[PDB]
Enzyme design. Sequence first.
Site, PDB file in Angstrom:
ATOM      1  N   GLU A   1      -8.456  -7.958  12.875  1.00  0.00           N
ATOM      2  CA  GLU A   1      -7.909  -9.315  12.848  1.00  0.00           C
ATOM      3  C   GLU A   1      -9.002 -10.355  12.631  1.00  0.00           C
ATOM      4  O   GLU A   1      -8.833 -11.288  11.847  1.00  0.00           O
ATOM      5  CB  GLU A   1      -7.132  -9.603  14.131  1.00  0.00           C
ATOM      6  CG  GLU A   1      -5.878  -8.762  14.248  1.00  0.00           C
ATOM      7  CD  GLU A   1      -5.118  -9.005  15.533  1.00  0.00           C
ATOM      8  OE1 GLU A   1      -5.276 -10.097  16.122  1.00  0.00           O
ATOM      9  OE2 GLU A   1      -4.357  -8.100  15.943  1.00  0.00           O
TER      10      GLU A   1
ATOM     11  N   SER B   1      -0.158  -7.448   0.623  1.00  0.00           N
ATOM     12  CA  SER B   1      -1.001  -6.386   1.139  1.00  0.00           C
ATOM     13  C   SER B   1      -1.920  -5.944   0.003  1.00  0.00           C
ATOM     14  O   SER B   1      -2.580  -6.761  -0.642  1.00  0.00           O
ATOM     15  CB  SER B   1      -0.121  -5.236   1.682  1.00  0.00           C
ATOM     16  OG  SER B   1      -0.810  -3.993   1.798  1.00  0.00           O
TER      17      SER B   1
ATOM     18  N   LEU C   1       0.803  -1.227   0.000  1.00  0.00           N
ATOM     19  CA  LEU C   1       0.000   0.000   0.000  1.00  0.00           C
ATOM     20  C   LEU C   1       0.837   1.279   0.000  1.00  0.00           C
ATOM     21  O   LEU C   1       0.458   2.281  -0.618  1.00  0.00           O
ATOM     22  CB  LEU C   1      -0.943   0.015   1.208  1.00  0.00           C
ATOM     23  CG  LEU C   1      -2.033   1.092   1.170  1.00  0.00           C
ATOM     24  CD1 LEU C   1      -3.124   0.709   0.194  1.00  0.00           C
ATOM     25  CD2 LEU C   1      -2.619   1.314   2.556  1.00  0.00           C
TER      26      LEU C   1
ATOM     27  N   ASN D   1     -11.665  -9.933  -0.356  1.00  0.00           N
ATOM     28  CA  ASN D   1     -13.089  -9.679  -0.623  1.00  0.00           C
ATOM     29  C   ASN D   1     -13.359  -8.170  -0.473  1.00  0.00           C
ATOM     30  O   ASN D   1     -14.172  -7.764   0.359  1.00  0.00           O
ATOM     31  CB  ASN D   1     -13.909 -10.488   0.402  1.00  0.00           C
ATOM     32  CG  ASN D   1     -15.345 -10.819  -0.036  1.00  0.00           C
ATOM     33  OD1 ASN D   1     -16.048 -11.495   0.728  1.00  0.00           O
ATOM     34  ND2 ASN D   1     -15.779 -10.394  -1.221  1.00  0.00           N
TER      35      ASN D   1
ATOM     36  N   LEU E   1     -12.012  -9.884  11.165  1.00  0.00           N
ATOM     37  CA  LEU E   1     -12.524  -9.751   9.803  1.00  0.00           C
ATOM     38  C   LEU E   1     -11.599 -10.417   8.795  1.00  0.00           C
ATOM     39  O   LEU E   1     -12.056 -11.100   7.881  1.00  0.00           O
ATOM     40  CB  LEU E   1     -12.679  -8.273   9.425  1.00  0.00           C
ATOM     41  CG  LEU E   1     -13.774  -7.449  10.098  1.00  0.00           C
ATOM     42  CD1 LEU E   1     -13.786  -6.050   9.497  1.00  0.00           C
ATOM     43  CD2 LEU E   1     -15.137  -8.112   9.940  1.00  0.00           C
ATOM     44  N   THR E   2     -10.297 -10.219   8.975  1.00  0.00           N
ATOM     45  CA  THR E   2      -9.304 -10.790   8.068  1.00  0.00           C
ATOM     46  C   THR E   2      -9.342 -12.319   8.116  1.00  0.00           C
ATOM     47  O   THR E   2      -9.352 -12.979   7.073  1.00  0.00           O
ATOM     48  CB  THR E   2      -7.907 -10.275   8.418  1.00  0.00           C
ATOM     49  OG1 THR E   2      -7.860  -8.870   8.145  1.00  0.00           O
ATOM     50  CG2 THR E   2      -6.825 -10.992   7.609  1.00  0.00           C
ATOM     51  N   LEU E   3      -9.401 -12.880   9.325  1.00  0.00           N
ATOM     52  CA  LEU E   3      -9.478 -14.328   9.471  1.00  0.00           C
ATOM     53  C   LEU E   3     -10.703 -14.892   8.763  1.00  0.00           C
ATOM     54  O   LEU E   3     -10.612 -15.856   7.997  1.00  0.00           O
ATOM     55  CB  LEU E   3      -9.514 -14.713  10.948  1.00  0.00           C
ATOM     56  CG  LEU E   3      -9.694 -16.210  11.249  1.00  0.00           C
ATOM     57  CD1 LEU E   3      -8.568 -17.084  10.669  1.00  0.00           C
ATOM     58  CD2 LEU E   3      -9.829 -16.436  12.753  1.00  0.00           C
ATOM     59  N   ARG E   4     -11.861 -14.298   9.016  1.00  0.00           N
ATOM     60  CA  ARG E   4     -13.092 -14.826   8.452  1.00  0.00           C
ATOM     61  C   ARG E   4     -13.133 -14.682   6.928  1.00  0.00           C
ATOM     62  O   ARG E   4     -13.600 -15.578   6.226  1.00  0.00           O
ATOM     63  CB  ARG E   4     -14.316 -14.203   9.130  1.00  0.00           C
ATOM     64  CG  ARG E   4     -14.478 -14.696  10.573  1.00  0.00           C
ATOM     65  CD  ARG E   4     -15.779 -14.231  11.210  1.00  0.00           C
ATOM     66  NE  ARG E   4     -15.853 -12.778  11.360  1.00  0.00           N
ATOM     67  CZ  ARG E   4     -15.316 -12.094  12.366  1.00  0.00           C
ATOM     68  NH1 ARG E   4     -14.643 -12.726  13.324  1.00  0.00           N
ATOM     69  NH2 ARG E   4     -15.450 -10.773  12.414  1.00  0.00           N
TER      70      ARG E   4
ATOM     71  N   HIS F   1       1.866 -10.389   9.127  1.00  0.00           N
ATOM     72  CA  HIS F   1       1.791  -9.568   7.923  1.00  0.00           C
ATOM     73  C   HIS F   1       3.031  -8.681   7.877  1.00  0.00           C
ATOM     74  O   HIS F   1       2.990  -7.503   8.250  1.00  0.00           O
ATOM     75  CB  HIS F   1       0.528  -8.709   7.944  1.00  0.00           C
ATOM     76  CG  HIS F   1      -0.736  -9.486   8.160  1.00  0.00           C
ATOM     77  ND1 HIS F   1      -1.203 -10.422   7.262  1.00  0.00           N
ATOM     78  CD2 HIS F   1      -1.639  -9.456   9.171  1.00  0.00           C
ATOM     79  CE1 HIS F   1      -2.341 -10.923   7.701  1.00  0.00           C
ATOM     80  NE2 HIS F   1      -2.625 -10.362   8.863  1.00  0.00           N
TER      81      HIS F   1
HETATM   82 SE1  LIG Z   1      -4.726 -19.659   4.262  1.00  0.00          SE
HETATM   83  C1  LIG Z   1      -6.015 -20.142   5.587  1.00  0.00           C
HETATM   84  C2  LIG Z   1      -6.891 -19.193   6.116  1.00  0.00           C
HETATM   85  C3  LIG Z   1      -7.830 -19.561   7.079  1.00  0.00           C
HETATM   86  C4  LIG Z   1      -7.881 -20.882   7.526  1.00  0.00           C
HETATM   87  C5  LIG Z   1      -6.995 -21.826   6.990  1.00  0.00           C
HETATM   88  C6  LIG Z   1      -6.067 -21.452   6.032  1.00  0.00           C
HETATM   89  C7  LIG Z   1      -5.092 -22.484   5.446  1.00  0.00           C
HETATM   90  O1  LIG Z   1      -4.499 -22.347   4.408  1.00  0.00           O
HETATM   91  N1  LIG Z   1      -4.906 -23.668   6.229  1.00  0.00           N
HETATM   92  C8  LIG Z   1      -4.021 -24.774   5.834  1.00  0.00           C
HETATM   93  C9  LIG Z   1      -4.071 -25.820   6.960  1.00  0.00           C
HETATM   94  C10 LIG Z   1      -3.219 -27.047   6.641  1.00  0.00           C
HETATM   95  C11 LIG Z   1      -3.766 -27.605   5.352  1.00  0.00           C
HETATM   96  C12 LIG Z   1      -3.680 -26.585   4.208  1.00  0.00           C
HETATM   97  C13 LIG Z   1      -2.288 -26.203   4.072  1.00  0.00           C
HETATM   98  C14 LIG Z   1      -1.758 -25.539   5.278  1.00  0.00           C
HETATM   99  C15 LIG Z   1      -1.803 -26.561   6.413  1.00  0.00           C
HETATM  100  C16 LIG Z   1      -2.601 -24.386   5.697  1.00  0.00           C
HETATM  101  C17 LIG Z   1      -4.528 -25.432   4.627  1.00  0.00           C
END
Ligand SMILES: *[Se]c1ccccc1C(=O)N[C@]12C[C@H]3C[C@H](C[C@H](C3)C1)C2
Length: 283
Positions: free
Chosen positions: A229, A125, A41, A153, A231-234, A261
């Site tokens: 954090e 980013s 950014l 998104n 929002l980013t996870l979901r 990050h």
């Molecule tokens: Se990038 C992400 C974002 C939110 C939840 C899970 C993930 C993700 O990629 N999880 C993994 C878990 C295991 C199997 C796959 C490869 C590695 C190790 C990351 C997916």
Amino acid sequence: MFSRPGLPVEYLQVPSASMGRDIKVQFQGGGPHAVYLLDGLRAQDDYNGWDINTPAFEEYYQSGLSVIMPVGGQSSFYTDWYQPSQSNGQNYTYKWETFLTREMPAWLQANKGVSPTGNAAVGLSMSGGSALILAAYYPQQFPYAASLSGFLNPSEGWWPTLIGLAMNDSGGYNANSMWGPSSDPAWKRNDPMVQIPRLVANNTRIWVYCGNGTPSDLGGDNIPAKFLEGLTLRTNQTFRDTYAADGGRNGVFNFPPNGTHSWPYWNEQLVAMKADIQHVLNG
Ligand SMILES: *[Se]c1ccccc1C(=O)N[C@]12C[C@H]3C[C@H](C[C@H](C3)C1)C2
């Protein structure tokens, strides 16, 4: 910071007719196919953040791939804007999609022997989503795309507002000038989540890194870190799950527990994907 002395790194000036100025590009020639390393950014006009913060040139030296680091475009999302930013007196219109997909590859072919097709786009980013969108609409140019801590998104929920806050903080750029109000079709057009079906149809090889912790380049002073954090996870979970649900099967996801990050982790991803890119692009 930076790469070892003695590498064949060139600082090029590439004319952009669409932007009415030369764009600086840091370049290391090493084969007809290339990795386009897109900045974050707060991209500055002196050096690309990949060069400032990492030994990317050194890491990809003798890889059989050229390395292209465009310089500049703070808060641009590497997109074609509707108009100049109206909040900071920008005296031209960002046309970075036109530059990356037409002007720059034509110039690099003529002047450096780089193929306009069969390349990789790698962003972080702000430019993580850019990389995926470039592959979505230009699959011949980019059979491979990586998004590292990207905004997956941008058209959904609070994301247009949060992105607007970040763009204003990063040089006073107005998101309305870029993609219009959040109801404008440009927001969905440029949304990786929304364009998953294109990524699937083209069988794009995607590499996605999801980070933890303190947000990079997101929201503003008012926004609680924990809210961002979450929002980013979901959003990241939704992207990975939607990719699979829509028939996607060519995506490598990465979510190390300690990953943040930050440039050291983004560089670790760049190093980790080298063999993958070599195989996909060069056989
Ligand atoms: Se990038 C992400 C974002 C939110 C939840 C899970 C993930 C993700 O990629 N999880 C993994 C878990 C295991 C199997 C796959 C490869 C590695 C190790 C990351 C997916």
